[PDB]
Amino acid sequence: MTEYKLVVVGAGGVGKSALTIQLIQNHFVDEYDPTIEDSYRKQVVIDGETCLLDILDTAGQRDQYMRTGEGFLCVFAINNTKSFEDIHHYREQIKRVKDSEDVPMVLVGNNCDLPSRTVDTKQAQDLARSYGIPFIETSAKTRQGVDDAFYTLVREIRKHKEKMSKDGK
Ligand SMILES: Nc1nc2c(ncn2[C@@H]2O[C@H](COP(=O)(O)OP(=O)(O)NP(=O)(O)O)[C@@H](O)[C@H]2O)c(=O)[nH]1
């Protein structure tokens, strides 16, 4: 099969671990145990391809994981304006470490079940459109969007691989 190295990045407390554990283990972690660094491997069928997902769940509050990752799940929380503002800085850091302008990424607005919203859907859709990447709203609590976020990132990596192979021709 093909292995895909995915890295979940973003500010503290936005739900990176809860999203990843929903994908891997199908349950919601209600408690908040700040991560040092956790890794998971999951075989899944995406678009009738058997792939191995190697997923790195990073600390919220770097260069090595940015070098290794093939695609980045850039998570903010819709109730945390700073976490949304942080995305630009994560993206610039990744571009710098990769020495490249084209890096597979998906923007994820988590906590979409909460009423305390300070980041509008349009703000985030507009940002993703500028970066040329998908935007998915998710809730690790209700599982809304979880599979879509990770599978979309695999699709972006596949597209990148084709754009690079055709770029070399
Ligand atoms: N209502 C709701 N709570 C969520 C959601 N995602 C995460 N949480 C809660 O938010 C808290 C932090 O989640 P967690 O996944 O640990 O955040 P993190 O981004 O991994 N933090 P760190 O960067 O310190 O490891 C936990 O109490 C978790 O239950 C969500 O979509 N909705």
Ligand SMILES: [Mg+2]
């Ligand atoms: Mg965590």
